[PDB]
Design a protein around this ligand. Structure first.
Ligand SMILES: C[C@](N)(CCC[C@H](N)C(=O)O)C(=O)O
Ligand SMILES: C[C@](N)(CCC[C@H](N)C(=O)O)C(=O)O
Ligand SMILES: C[C@](N)(CCC[C@H](N)C(=O)O)C(=O)O
Ligand SMILES: C[C@](N)(CCC[C@H](N)C(=O)O)C(=O)O
Ligand SMILES: C[C@](N)(CCC[C@H](N)C(=O)O)C(=O)O
Ligand SMILES: C[C@](N)(CCC[C@H](N)C(=O)O)C(=O)O
Lengths: 288, 287, 287, 301, 287, 301
């Protein structure tokens, strides 16, 4: 078989985008996606994103498979690429917004004049059971700066879902601030990702506060590893920073691949994420 | 501002192959190749290989740019991919062989009946000055199991060129055999690659002898890092194993991505390398 | 005057496509179209197809003039060329579907991943006098494997309309299966085309069944002659094959210029046709 | 769909050819301005594809206007629709003259010298707009035509027997740079009614005959009067065309050699008439006929 | 810094076109534009035109700086160049039209089959104070063939705005028809351009009527001087010719650099201008 | 629309010229790297088109940096905006020097030897970035300027009568490879206020005068002091430019010969000042002035 696609990246978080507007079922299996995402034996990507037909009135729907083949419920860098991809297919020039049905609910990206995409990422989910996490809520049903014992070491974490689960930490329990570049993600990351307290596994964001409006982070993603950026993660860590009282609702988040502008609007409780999305190459891959 | 190409890999050492038969000048610059080889911002590859017009009578010529943009003189996994590419482009089925002009001289791949590609990789260069290395020859003009001080630690190395430079080590001076999987390549690799004793930098192969006909290795390549396989490297390390008296001329070399059959024939001093090569996808990249 | 156009072909059924989105009236007359279609004195084509403004909500409308100047009500190969032509004018990339108003009613082409076009050709018309044919229905209101006397010789034919009229035959009455390549179309074709039983003339398809899902055919088109392919004809002959019990609803139809995939869906009674369409050249003709 | 790196690379390697379409009595050609180079802009294989009437532009051939040679104003090279390269083309050189006149904004009478594979050819747009061409002198020596038939009238092959698929025909051979086999009928047979011939059937048997090493063009002739001939032609590499200028010149030479017609004749071809004159004064043949532009464009290669 | 641009001209009225689609803020200042427009010390042009993001729904917006640095509200020759610039940047083929927001309101250029551009230049503004001019309206609120004293000499003029102001004259009050080529524009032009009756200065068109459908003109433009052509000027002078009863609504206007086809439609009060636009070179200018 | 195969084929965007735009005191030029050949990359006709300010790139001329001749580092050829080829250009060679320094990434003081139609010219980039050029020696012999005026001071034409459109002017003739006609006023007339002259009117009468076989550049001079001259120029083939380096050199030579100024003068040109010195020690003339890059680009041909 043959899979036609277009390669895009949002701050280095790269994806295989496929036009699946003709069917409600993804053109390839999760197993095929995992093979295609292998960087040496396949096309190479952090995931495969499908542009599908709208659901209940939305312009389109989006489904995504992580490079390990699992299906997460949303992807911020990916939805910015999705908007640019649709624009290319439909010859839409300049500013345009679309309603997208996703596993996290309604998401509304709007292409900006400069080509970046400002996305309405919806509202954060903080109730422990729905994140989901087995940690007990310590601020209402929300888990904020709570103890998580990781391989015998006590860390403090805040849990938030953007449809997908995030475990955000600013450091160990009773410990100093983090210098995220000093962390050994391949070592510590998997211990959070597969922790027994996260039934569906979790994405993990390690954060260093530079100022109340400027945060630096590294992320170990569920099913994708140490990526250059994670949009849902940047949204979740700003929510966590606000809940822990370490930063304000509008921050610039520096991710390994570059910055994102995040704002958690108190007026509507929605989170807006603005960042770039760029097409890299067009192709056809051999399917097995 | 668009490059059409086909992606291939030889044991996981993956490349962007471009049909450059219509010109003597590579279609893209070394700087553009480095960008295209970036795995997250580009197409992603260990290098870009160009199929160019023959030279002085060869069927074709091959030029390659490492993912860092530098231009090495040969690539074994790459030439096996080159052979599949040509057969694809010329609709050649079954056994076929082509003469290819490279920076290492004449190279002759031959697609076998079983589909694998057996390549005549030329003869190894052992004279120290030509590898090139500033290390002094201790076995005739060759550098064999000689001391190399790496970040203050003494290692024993053997140097051989397959057009490109290789530094092969079976362990530290006065040290035990290596368990290559225990090495931290990102840490030790760059120290060999940019060592002052290698004027043009060097590829480095770490080897574990399993038997006199079976070697296991990991490699830190000049300009490409810790790749899954290196064909010139596998050829050079068998030459080194023979010179150090650790193995015979015919060996199976296990590389991270898989095995290669290597034979340094005493009959003609040529080294033959047999391995796979597979197309993965094709497309057009924005430049 | 000057007519600007783009030449396309669908399996060799070639057309002159003109951007007529500016007016509800075709830019040239039927007489001018016939002249332009002359292969040695004009541009050369089986027809001229106009991309016109939508009607009652459709994205566009399509009108076509045969190479003899007559105006048929639809064209399958032509609408596949139309879809690629419009995609170009709208700067669209990849898959796109369009609603097109035609003399056969709504037609919906959809560009596929491989550049091919799958078209919802609507539902077939089988009522005898609406085909139109003067032959009496012999199976319900339809004419199925009925006797047609052509120049004194009895043939059995099935009539179906895809907006335009089709007369399909699998052979003479009481005769063996056909070897379509042995037919002399220039001789027999005109006798069917202008037959008194077809008031508006008819397209004629001669069919050879290779299997229940594989049919071979040749066609003598109303106003265009022995073309390399006819999409409405391929659709009509599959309908005829099903009605005569000779084949399944899903078939590969081999036409002189190539194959088409046809499916007369039992679920909705719609017929889907998938085939290629390619641009050949851009031009300006003297009027 | 099949994964095919080969097909894919071909598709993205498409070129473009700008041209103007002309026809001389229905013998239609793709004219290209190649004055910028001594090498034809496209290959013979590409020309064959472009000449396909359903999958390409459609034509009996592709004609290139090239830079002059050893003096001449221009040079002309032509590829048949089958891709082969013939030495000359009469209807084509009349189209060539119009093409040049159009490109150089030349109005009224104008003559150009053209270098061809048949030697010097000199077309001249007439006051009345038609193009009268000095087609040079005919080649009659058998081995130079070329034909393996033995000269039977001096070194020329005139009304000689040619066994075609076991049937004896009488033919006359003459070259206008390109080879021509002219017949007025079968040996010991009646005059021909050319419209009754089945060219697709008989044509190929002459075209590829073993007696014509470089293949041949074949003209079937019906004499209407000593100054009026009717013909049909099966051309080497182009088939049953509507007209052939070198053919009309060759058949008048043949008619004169066989004593059937005068040196000044009106020749009726499927697409129309040509005025031909084989001047005894200088042995040159003059051909007068029309040429018209039809459309112009850019073809994908 | 550096400014990348493409040079175009519409009948010799030449401009520096810049791709400013990424921001509503022009890439350079008015002062920088004046410097770049200097023909000996800069790039040389009658103005700089920016292709910007759409506004309130239009496909794009256009802003222009005259060679003196002032910002006029529209430019007809420039919008034709703008349309070809977009087509080039987007590799659009065939007929395409775009909605453009300008200081004069909506303007809609459409690329024609022959490559010319036909533009819906909007509707003319005749109310004196909106032109703007301080002359009193003498035909309703419009100034038509009214006395304007220029440096002590009485001229009759008609004022119309196409977003930008235009003062059209067919001659002096009580004087004969003009032979525009005999005028000394560098001398008389500035006296109209900076006249006290034109608060925002004005463009001035001198017209010679050749027939009721054929007008010859020369223009002295506000902020650009004696240019080879002015599209808004050609539209305004046809409006003036109609108002003065000297010509019909559809005219060919001969400007120094060539002709424009102009039509002021009574059906909707819109004026359509058709003419050429050609790219000359592209470059990068030092800022 | 008219059917026009010719227009269609012309419109097929032939070639492209890469260049860099420079100006010396407003005398602006298109500089092209032509170091790979002794033949200019474009024709004189193409240069004239490119120099059109509204339809082309716009310039007073096109200057080619060519390969050295007889050991010089480089050679320079220039085409005026009217297409004619003059033998030297002072403002141009200063731009040429900076162009070279850019192509060779040369920093600081540098001098190159340039072969020109005027012979050897040697520009040197100063520390301040200005360029001081050794313009060679001036040619004063009447017939070598060339001019048909009789030498009235040795073999030189100094303050001699030239009847221009019936009016008597006094002029001095000097060549800097190219011809120059310098005037400080009419015969028996007062000093000039150069800004009051109507150059487009009087200029062409001198430029095409019968006494100048190869036409001539004309400099109108107003002496401000013995070391300060103001001028305007009407150049052969370029018109009223903002500055002319060879002209500034020639008018200082003329001022000295007529005894109106010293060998070292500041010359005020419309676009700015130039420092000129006619060294008595070697009879060489040195011109110092600026040169600036403006933009670079690619023009359609
Ligand atoms: C694409 C993404 N990195 C999220 C990917 C999904 C994530 N790996 C998960 O398993 O939830 C983003 O939000 O930008
Ligand atoms: C492609 C290759 N790994 C060699 C690549 C070139 C190598 N990185 C070098 O710089 O010499 C091989 O021999 O298989
Ligand atoms: C273009 C077409 N061959 C139909 C052409 C119309 C046909 N000649 C007719 O007169 O009905 C098709 O259906 O593909
Ligand atoms: C164009 C032409 N028909 C001749 C074409 C060349 C001919 N097919 C050949 O192969 O000799 C003519 O002479 O008019
Ligand atoms: C570019 C233009 N000449 C108008 C330029 C604007 C004019 N100089 C003004 O100041 O109004 C046109 O309308 O074609
Ligand atoms: C460029 C220049 N103005 C001279 C140009 C050549 C002059 N137009 C001539 O024809 O002699 C100079 O000397 O500076």
């Amino acid at each position: 078989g043959v899979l036609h696609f277009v390669k895009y990246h949002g701050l280095g978080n790269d994806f295989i985008l496929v036009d699946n507007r003709d069917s409600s079922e993804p053109k390839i299996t999760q197993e095929q996606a995992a093979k295609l995402c292998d960087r040496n034996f396949g096309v190479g990507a952090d995931g495969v994103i499908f542009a599908m037909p709208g659901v209940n009135g939305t312009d389109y729907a989006m489904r995504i498979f992580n490079s390990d083949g699992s299906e997460p419920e949303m992807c911020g860098n990916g939805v910015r690429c999705f908007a640019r991809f649709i624009a290319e297919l439909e010859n839409l020039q300049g500013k345009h917004s679309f309603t997208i049905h996703t596993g996290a609910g309604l998401i509304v990206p709007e292409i900006q004049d400069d080509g970046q995409v400002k996305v309405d990422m919806g509202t954060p989910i903080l109730k422990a059971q729905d994140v989901p996490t087995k940690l007990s809520g310590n601020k209402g049903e929300a888990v904020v700066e709570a103890e998580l014992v990781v391989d015998g070491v006590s860390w403090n974490v805040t849990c938030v879902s953007m449809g997908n689960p995030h475990c955000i930490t600013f450091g160990k329990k009773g410990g100093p601030n983090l210098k995220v570049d000093d962390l050994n993600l391949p070592e510590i990351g998997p211990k959070f990702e597969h922790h027994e307290m996260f039934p569906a596994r979790t994405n993990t964001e390690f954060v260093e506060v530079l100022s109340r409006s400027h945060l630096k982070m590294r992320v170990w993603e569920r099913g994708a590893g140490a990526t250059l950026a994670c949009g849902t993660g940047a949204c979740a860590l700003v929510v966590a920073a606000v809940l822990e009282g370490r930063a304000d609702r509008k921050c610039t988040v520096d991710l390994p691949g570059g910055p994102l502008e995040i704002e958690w609007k108190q007026e509507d409780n929605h989170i807006y994420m603005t960042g770039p999305a760029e097409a890299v190459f067009y192709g056809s891959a051999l399917l097995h």
